[model samples]
Target: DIPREPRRIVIHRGSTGLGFNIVGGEPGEGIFISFILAGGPADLSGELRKGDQILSVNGVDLRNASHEQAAIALKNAGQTVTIIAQYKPEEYSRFEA
Candidate 1:
């Protein structure tokens, strides 16, 4: 059985209307969301990177949660939150194909 790791929902926060943004020059790649320090669990695990997609939270769909809503859910879950996400690879670059 797959390990049941604690996870939480995270979203990108920026001035732009779009919820997400691209960090590198490449488009459709290097997309990232802001990392929130919720009790510092994520920082300690080192599993949550700056550029990652919050696919779900405790099996809850993240798409329903706005950037602000997601943050609140994470806080409520605390250390037990299980964050499921797909991370944007650092290899993505404008210079690459």
Candidate 2:
């Protein structure tokens, strides 16, 4: 676990905190950060960045949640939004084997 295996990313929101979009997950892996809004909630906060895995929502584990399930959790994360994530340097190439 050289990449630290897992880490927590907590973001305190004010109605509009999260400034990123989740396009997909890694099938049996982690939630993907499809895009990030420049200087938005995510960019502004140093806790969350180019994440490879979504460790949790608030305090609930997200490592095993499907893309659909994860989508729901992020949508309803009240003013106090907490996210856990793992930093992965390598990008998952869809067309590569």
Candidate 3:
């Protein structure tokens, strides 16, 4: 399926690690929101959801990033982060690829 248009939102970092898991960023793949934790920062933002492609995090490009790069970017995002993302329910299938 066609992906949705990109959107930007800011979410503050909670006590823990943003309250979500990230996947993808392999060859020919981009980073994506694998799952959201209940009552977490991402969950409370009401903006992020599973299957969302993360184009950038806090101005750091993730479109061609590796899993390690993405992980470091998020970890160093300070206390809050701005994200550019696109929701793609169909892309979720790639998680198993």
Candidate 4:
């Protein structure tokens, strides 16, 4: 199934904080928002979530990037970074019986 439209989120950090923890997996998996730190930058923005998959960082597409590469890319981002992402439907919600 197709995912929802990608949403762009701008993340800014000084010495720390990217809003959440990043997860790496198979290429197609992109990157997962493994954990959303409470009261963190991400939580404050209210755009990022636990299941959201990161598609790109600062306009660079990470459609086929590995975990290490994704980490490097995000780390390279200085003060501000724009991320485009969408959540897997199944990962986003639970259906009521």
Question: What C-alpha lDDT do the candidate models reach, one value each?
Answer: 0.46, 0.65, 0.84, 0.74
Q: In model 3, where is the ten-residue run with the lowest total lDDT?
A: 88-97
For residues 1-97, could you state the per-residue lDDT of candidate 2 as single tens digits? 3354666666656435577766445456567666667767777775555545576888877766777888888888776677777765454234223
* Model 2 regions more than 4 Å off: 1-5, 14-17, 25-27, 91-97
Can you list the residue pairs that collide in candidate 2? 55-84
Q: Which pairs of residues collide in candidate 1?
A: 6-82, 7-81, 7-82, 7-83, 8-82, 8-83, 12-33
TM-score of decoy 3: 0.88
**Model 4 over residues 1-97: C-alpha lDDT tens digits?**
4347888989887445686777776565567677777777777788876777788999888878877888888888778889898886464333111
TM of each candidate vs. truth: 0.47, 0.72, 0.88, 0.80
The TM-score of candidate 2 is 0.72
Worst 10 residues of 4 by lDDT: 88-97
Off by over 4 Å in 4: 1-3, 89-97
How far out, in Å, is residue 52 in model 4? 0.7
> Considering only N, C-alpha and C atoms within 3 Å, which residue pairs clash in candidate 3?
none
User: Best candidate, TM-score-wise?
Assistant: 3
Task: State the RMSD for candidate 4.
Answer: 4.8
| Candidate structures ordered by lDDT, highest first | 3, 4, 2, 1
Give the per-residue lDDT of model 3 (tens digit) for 2-93.
34789897888888678888897664578888989899999898888888888999998888888788888988988889989899778766
